[PDB]
Subunit: 346 residues, 5 copies
Amino acid sequence: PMPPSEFLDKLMGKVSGYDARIRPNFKGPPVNVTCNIFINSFGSIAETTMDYRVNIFLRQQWNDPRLAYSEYPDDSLDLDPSMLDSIWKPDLFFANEKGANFHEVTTDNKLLRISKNGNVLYSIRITLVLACPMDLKNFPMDVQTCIMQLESYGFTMNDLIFEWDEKGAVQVADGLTLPQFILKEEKDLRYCTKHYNTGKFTCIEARFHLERQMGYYLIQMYIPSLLIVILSWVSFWINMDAAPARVGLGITTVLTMTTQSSGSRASLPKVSYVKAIDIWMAVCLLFVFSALLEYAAVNFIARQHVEEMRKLFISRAKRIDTVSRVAFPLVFLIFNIFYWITYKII
Amino acid sequence: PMPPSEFLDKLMGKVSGYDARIRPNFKGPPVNVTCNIFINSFGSIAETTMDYRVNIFLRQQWNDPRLAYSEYPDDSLDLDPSMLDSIWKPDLFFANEKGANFHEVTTDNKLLRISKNGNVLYSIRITLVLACPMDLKNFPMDVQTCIMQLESYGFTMNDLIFEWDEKGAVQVADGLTLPQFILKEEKDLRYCTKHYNTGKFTCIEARFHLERQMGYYLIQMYIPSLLIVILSWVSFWINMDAAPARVGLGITTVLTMTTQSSGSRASLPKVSYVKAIDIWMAVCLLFVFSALLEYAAVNFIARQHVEEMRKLFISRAKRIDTVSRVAFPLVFLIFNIFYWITYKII
Amino acid sequence: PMPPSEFLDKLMGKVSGYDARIRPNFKGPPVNVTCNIFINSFGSIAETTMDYRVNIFLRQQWNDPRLAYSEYPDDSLDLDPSMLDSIWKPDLFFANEKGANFHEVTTDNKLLRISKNGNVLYSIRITLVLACPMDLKNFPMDVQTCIMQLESYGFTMNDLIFEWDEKGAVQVADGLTLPQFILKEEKDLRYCTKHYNTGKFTCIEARFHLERQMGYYLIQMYIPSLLIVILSWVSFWINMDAAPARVGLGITTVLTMTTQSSGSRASLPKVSYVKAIDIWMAVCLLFVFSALLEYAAVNFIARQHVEEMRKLFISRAKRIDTVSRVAFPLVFLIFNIFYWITYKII
Amino acid sequence: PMPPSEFLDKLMGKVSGYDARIRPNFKGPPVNVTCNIFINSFGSIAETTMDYRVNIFLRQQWNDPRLAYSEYPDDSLDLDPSMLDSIWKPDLFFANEKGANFHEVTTDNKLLRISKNGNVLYSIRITLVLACPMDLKNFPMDVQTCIMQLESYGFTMNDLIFEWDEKGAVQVADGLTLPQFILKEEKDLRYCTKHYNTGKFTCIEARFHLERQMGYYLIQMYIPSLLIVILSWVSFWINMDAAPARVGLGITTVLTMTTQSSGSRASLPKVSYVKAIDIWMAVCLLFVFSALLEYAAVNFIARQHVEEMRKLFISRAKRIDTVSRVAFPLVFLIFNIFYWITYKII
Amino acid sequence: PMPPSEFLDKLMGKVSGYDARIRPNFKGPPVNVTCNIFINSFGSIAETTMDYRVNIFLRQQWNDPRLAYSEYPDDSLDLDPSMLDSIWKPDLFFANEKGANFHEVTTDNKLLRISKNGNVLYSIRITLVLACPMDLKNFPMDVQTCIMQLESYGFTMNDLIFEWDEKGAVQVADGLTLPQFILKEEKDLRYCTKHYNTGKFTCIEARFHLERQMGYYLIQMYIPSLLIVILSWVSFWINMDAAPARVGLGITTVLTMTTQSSGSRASLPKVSYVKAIDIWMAVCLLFVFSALLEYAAVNFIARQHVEEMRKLFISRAKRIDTVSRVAFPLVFLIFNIFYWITYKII
Ligand SMILES: *[C@@H]1O[C@H](CO)[C@@H](O[C@@H]2O[C@H](CO)[C@@H](O[C@@H]3O[C@H](CO)[C@@H](O)[C@H](O)[C@@H]3O)[C@H](O)[C@H]2NC(C)=O)[C@H](O)[C@H]1NC(C)=O
Ligand SMILES: *[C@@H]1O[C@H](CO)[C@@H](O[C@@H]2O[C@H](CO)[C@@H](O[C@@H]3O[C@H](CO)[C@@H](O)[C@H](O)[C@@H]3O)[C@H](O)[C@H]2NC(C)=O)[C@H](O)[C@H]1NC(C)=O
Ligand SMILES: *[C@@H]1O[C@H](CO)[C@@H](O[C@@H]2O[C@H](CO)[C@@H](O[C@@H]3O[C@H](CO)[C@@H](O)[C@H](O)[C@@H]3O)[C@H](O)[C@H]2NC(C)=O)[C@H](O)[C@H]1NC(C)=O
Ligand SMILES: *[C@@H]1O[C@H](CO)[C@@H](O[C@@H]2O[C@H](CO)[C@@H](O[C@@H]3O[C@H](CO)[C@@H](O)[C@H](O)[C@@H]3O)[C@H](O)[C@H]2NC(C)=O)[C@H](O)[C@H]1NC(C)=O
Ligand SMILES: *[C@@H]1O[C@H](CO)[C@@H](O[C@@H]2O[C@H](CO)[C@@H](O[C@@H]3O[C@H](CO)[C@@H](O)[C@H](O)[C@@H]3O)[C@H](O)[C@H]2NC(C)=O)[C@H](O)[C@H]1NC(C)=O
């Protein structure tokens, strides 16, 4: 017999009237193309530009009666990736590409096989940098949901319809790990049918829940953010007579805590709303600032102190020192409870 | 009958004398091309290079009598995006491109349909990085106006005219949100007809008002910029005898405020004029510097103090301490009123 | 006779039925392609994106009976790199490309020679940026293993099989040096046969062990990380009466050590687990923090001190000063032993 | 009649012997090509790499007798930008390109019109990143001169000559503003004829004077650079008995001034010569360092002070304090005059 | 007669049997191609990636008897750069490209002329980013030697040999200046013949000595690195009774010197060996650390001081103060001599 390359020349050549500019089943029902992606590499999720780089295998399957051969004895004929400009292909595109490219390492990474009944498998490797609106109302304890939509651009709903297959619409790699987030096993599948001034177009999308890993932020901006508050608590255990001791403590600590506040949003987007890490530094900033005002109240009584009425001012300046050793270690603990409970339920 | 691919070969082939290098209605009136864009993604507005990345759908509509078919029973014939090099297309370009590229993810993102009367719709996806002169006279409270002009390069006014359509000249996406700014619903539409040494060319543009969100700057460079001034106010409530207490306070605070001034223009363009954030740090720098000179005036009187005339110098050195507790908390409030009123009207 | 260019036109032209879209030995055994790479340049191994740039010479050898000439008197015929689109080539690709490109400096860097029996050598220069999961459980003393897999995309196992040659499967350059790591002479060779929903494909890979050089981290983040702890030890040799001396020492040192902790993960990925450099700064942070609490215990006894019972409190406040000069210099040495032994065996 | 597309096929087709590989007026005088650029966008002038990005409209005009039509009734025939590979074009190139690209947004931005006498206008949009040797002998008050040369590569002087036109050789945009520098209205026009081992080639260039705007540097690195010196002057108004007051002032200020010196060359090229900003920080570093040595001379006399001869040492230690309040405020003013006069004339 | 474009069609057309896939002098001696480069732009030598960007004019000259015309009366025929795909060209490539590109600004920057005897000149503009192993054993006083090799990829030694010409093998631009380094006039020329598993290939290279300019490092990291040591010397001229004076001096200076050590390797590669700038900061770190231990020895004697034996401890605590004023100013000078002598000979 003849090889599949010469066998398909009768179906993709000048004979049989086959044209790559004509969609299958013309003047009839639209083409129902089913798609399924395979995430190979994931990560590099930046927040300054609010985008993430993904590498998926976009599989496409449809039905073309013009390529339904019945003379070849086999059931699957592989095609050279250099002959993709001869058959019709869906005009699939993403609405959040923001720059993309293919891979042509020694061969155009394309897969093309034709079944006997007319099933055509089209799998290619695409490297996308997808964008998603980052919701940072609770930055250290948020559940991001970055989606990706597959719309049409040249054909409307009556000519091309995208759908998901029931046999693993979205597969995940075996050893796919992320440096900062984690990929949940549950991925939603809903439609995203858009409507413009020209018409209506099909759209398919899949939700991806990306939960953060609190192990990183808990060590860098939570343990040092708590030890600095302890530095302001040791001033109560120091005598009220040493002026340079408690003054230098209430100033060097209250100024190095601002660096922690400025160092908590160094690589974060400039959002207007307040996040969960801005209420942890601001409240702890009040503790390192109230300790400065605490010494300002103790030193103000000692500098004012008549022999009987002045002996009570010394005890009054020391009575507040007996409560500050218990108030702040018990008030900061109350805020430490309302913080790790409210942001663990919402 | 015959498919539209073979039907349009009579209108785009060697027959009928149709050439892609000839504009419609030659030796007559110019081609009136109407355009309308659809902003899909917006943001990433940097200030060091004074540019912003945009992703729009550039729709183009004109009239070509050479493509006015009258035999096909339908009213809209979709075209393959691979056949855009056969018909005439307007030479539309932007005067502020500064690098651009198309999107060819599995298909050239182009839309092409031809009506019966000769209406040709041309919609493509372009990713532009547009530039605009940043007016930073009031940096935290400015209303930026970044525009984009669509000029001609090969045809003059007598051969190609660009205009805006009245049915939604500029559409906005449904869920288009910006991280730093906000997009106003009012967009101006005016002409930008340029004149060069070669001739005159058409030009269409649309204004985009981008108001900032003060919620970000109010927390990072306004709350810490005010608490440092309070650190210089607590020196008045400290006795005038402790030298290392008030000296270290008037130096560590006046030097950490300069870091806030240098940290306020870390990612800003090097403009010559003064902005609204440079007058907030410089005036607050005077308060943290006047407190240093305030102790220099109190300590200078105590070191100079004859038994009757010296008792008044001690009261004089304490009389200024009774006014500094009221002057600065009431003078900084006056500047706090004139600042948030002048920059809220202009 | 005729030159090899005209001699091979009979084997690569329209005659002999040779087609570049047909794999050798069709309807029979699969093509056994042996590959061997030659690493020219290596390094630039970043950790923020977890990727490294490599430049190898990908050699490919297979058997094509359709190109087995028997009339030319020579044994090796060199081919012009501009004629690679006429013969069949394996669709080799990498599963961790993440962007790649060729080199076309004055000539496409391709090698093509055909033997008499049908051996075809295919060598090209590819610049890859390969990714690997960075295991940073012990950051300064880890042995990274970055691999690279060569999979198929268009042909399954029954049509294309990749294998390694026994004569130097992976060669190393003569003067290939790395700035940070070192390349070990032992490189493992194992298979990576994947299985997808479409079928099974061949895969070959080679392990690369990249041991770090501790000479860099030992000087920058280990010598200064130890001298700061010595600054907290000198407070014991200072009299317990000078308050501003020991207070300023226990605060300026405990706050500059946090900068060393924040400066140890400035260009590191945001991992959740704790690494070996996070337990060296945190434990040393306890020493510079216990010295602050040590003075808080000595000053608390002196401020409390009845004529006979008060003379023992002065000796008690000095007895701890006689143990702190020996405890911390001997407790930090114990942690210094358990650290450099546990992380030198695992 | 026939359209210009079919009319010019007789002049650009196989007939008439017109070839795009032959320069006009062969075996005779060279082609005198006149050029004129139009700067659209300017700025982004970095100093680390010593380059600036420019966007100009390169117009080219020459004479081609082979295209001198005499049958068409019009005087200017516009050409499709897709037919630039049919006529001869000058091989113009820049000697300081360092990477460049064109703009192909929906159309190749090319202009091509042919006059009756043979005048051919060629205007294209080129985005260049031009380099210039940065002369930073006086960094805040220099007048940079970045030029751009247009050389030939394939034709020598006897075959191609570039010249400037007298009617606006270099035009400037109407609203072209720069963020840091300013563009002067005077632009020099001189030749740059080079000589290599192959021969001599034509060259045209234009000088661009880029004066800096001192409004930026005067606020960031000149006002804080002067207030720190004032902090060292207030130590003279403090009593000579307070040791921790004047010691901490002469150390915290002398160390934060070094940050201003290191912060003045953070984004500057590593040049060997000294600039005008390195002599302003180094001299001011002497003032904040002489104040430290001033207290070292006052405290050395007080610690040495026999009942009559010791009373003069106290007055001697205070006599220098009466001159330091007048010397430094009058010596720093002398350097402040010689600085803003020498660098305002050269 | 006929123009050179039509004259060379007889030598580059279907007639005469000329093929671009055949090297000259086949079945005979190899082609001796002589090359000579012309460095136009040089600099941008980074150290994090260990690469430098260069822009050279790669001239190539060989002998092709098939192009030896004898009928044209001239001696040099210029060729259009669009016809380089018709003649044979050497497959020259660099072994350290790491990404490269050509320049196509309005014309492919290629030079092609053919002599009567068969001499063919081939000059193109290539922008390379070449790599070299940075030897940083003495960072401020090293002599870097970055080379560039021109190897073959498709032809072995018996088919293509590269050589250097004796008439200026490597030329330098007239006004080529470097921001950091300097280019020496002496450039070595040696061979780099490599040997692989396939065979042996020709190779030509040229050495480039790049000496650093010490004027930059001497001001930024050598003058401030010496003044901080002077701050530790002034503590000896202060009385031994002021505790907060000498304690704060021996801590604030010893901690700001570590920033100079961390600030000396901010943009340097992470090498394991010690460089010449790491022994200048570490030794100076001992001086600012020995001054802290010097006060720890003086204060330890004063706190210990029986009426006759205690008067000698006061003199002993002051005797070391009389030697420290002379020891350190004379020991640091000894290290200052051995440093600037050992690194000025090797
Ligand atoms: C692609 O998928 C669409 C569905 O999304 C298919 O369209 C549906 O096709 C049926 C005929 O097969 C149309 O008729 C209906 O038939 C059912 C019985 O199956 C009957 O109960 C209904 O009353 C109706 O007559 C139906 O209108 C149509 N639906 C839509 C929304 O178009 C289409 O056939 C598929 N195309 C191919 C090539 O498989
Ligand atoms: C494209 O749009 C232009 C307008 O911007 C159209 O041009 C105008 O066309 C009219 C004829 O239709 C020209 O004549 C005028 O007619 C009015 C009555 O409608 C009459 O009152 C005037 O006195 C005049 O005779 C008019 O001069 C012309 N204007 C310009 C500025 O060119 C043009 O026809 C449109 N082209 C197409 C193909 O639709
Ligand atoms: C490519 O390599 C494969 C092996 O990976 C070759 O396949 C093996 O080929 C033999 C025949 O040569 C097949 O038959 C076996 O022969 C042995 C004797 O050599 C006999 O003991 C066995 O019982 C069996 O009959 C064998 O099944 C086959 N193995 C596989 C896994 O396919 C193949 O021939 C190679 N192709 C070329 C073109 O060299
Ligand atoms: C392109 O420009 C060059 C000048 O840069 C033109 O060349 C000059 O052409 C004249 C003839 O037109 C040559 O002859 C001279 O004529 C003058 C009178 O005009 C006479 O006084 C002189 O003694 C001499 O005979 C002249 O040598 C030549 N100069 C050079 C440097 O080539 C050239 O003609 C222009 N080409 C075109 C096509 O316009
Ligand atoms: C390209 O350069 C090579 C040299 O690198 C040329 O090869 C040498 O060519 C000579 C003949 O011209 C060969 O023969 C020798 O001749 C000398 C007298 O000149 C004689 O004393 C020797 O005993 C020997 O017979 C020589 O073997 C050969 N050397 C090599 C290494 O190949 C070659 O001819 C040049 N090609 C062209 C086209 O110019």
